[PDB]
Amino acid sequence: DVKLLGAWPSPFVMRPRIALNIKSVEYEFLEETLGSKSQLLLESNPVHKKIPVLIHGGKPICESLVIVEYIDEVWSPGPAILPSDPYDRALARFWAAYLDEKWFPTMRNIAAAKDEEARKALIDQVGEGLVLLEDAFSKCSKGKGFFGGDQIGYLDIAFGSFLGWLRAIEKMNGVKLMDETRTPGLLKWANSFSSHPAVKDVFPETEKLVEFAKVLAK
């Protein structure tokens, strides 16, 4: 009754997936294949032609974050994904928004860098980006293990959905962007997320993510 269109290595595809595992909503996973586009996609998401795409009642929903909020709402009876306080809720959205427009582009844009400089510059920001989210974690979690708190939340999805890749870009660049000193909470959090039940069977393997990068090469 629920169809999801994405691919094993898209962190955006992980977003509507985790959320579905939180509500216990089952779904059909319509894989896409590199370099091509299924007609069901070109059909269902004609504006961006991007994955993921949620299909619910014969209807399509687009933009991973919006799908997550829709999922939180259609299945309100289960564990709530977004926070509950109007302000707390707005915080999660600010950071998700920030992560999507600046943090991730910056971190992906690395590979494209060239002089070992720009490379550093990017990596530098990726660091500054983490120090903050380590700060946001500090208030957001109140000594609990997730942005959401005791349990997995909206901000854990958005930001956690990138761990496989960040773990992968680390390896392929001989750099560790999280460390005991500067982000000791996230280091701990990044391993209480990629192990969470709603994540552990939808989280890609760093290595597999590394073959795929080495493949997106050309």
How many Å apart are CA 210 and CA 167, to the nearest integer?
A: 9
Instruction: With residue 45 as reference, give the H or E element that holds it.
Output: none
Beta bridge partners of 127: none
SS3 assignment, position 215: helix
Is 51 within any annotated ligand binding site?
yes
- Report if residue 212 touches ligand GSH, rule: CB under 6 A: no
Among 44, 64, 141, 206, binds ligand GSH (CB under 6 A): 64
Strand order in the sheet with 60-62: 28-29, 2-5, 53-56, 60-62
How many Å apart are CA 140 and CA 148, to the nearest integer?
A: 7
Q: Which is nearer to ligand GSH, 49 or 139 (CB)?
A: 49
Min separation Cβ 6 and ligand GSH, Å: 7
- Report if residue 51 touches ligand GSH, rule: CB under 6 A: yes
Min separation Cβ 74 and ligand GSH, Å: 18
- Report if residue 183 touches ligand GSH, rule: CB under 6 A: no
Among 3, 37, 93, 120, binds ligand GSH (CB under 6 A): 37
Instruction: With residue 53 as reference, give the H or E element that holds it.
Output: strand 53-56
Q: Which residues lie near ligand GSH (CB under 6 A)? A: 10, 12, 32, 37, 49-51, 63-64
Annotated binding site for glutathione: 37, 51, 64
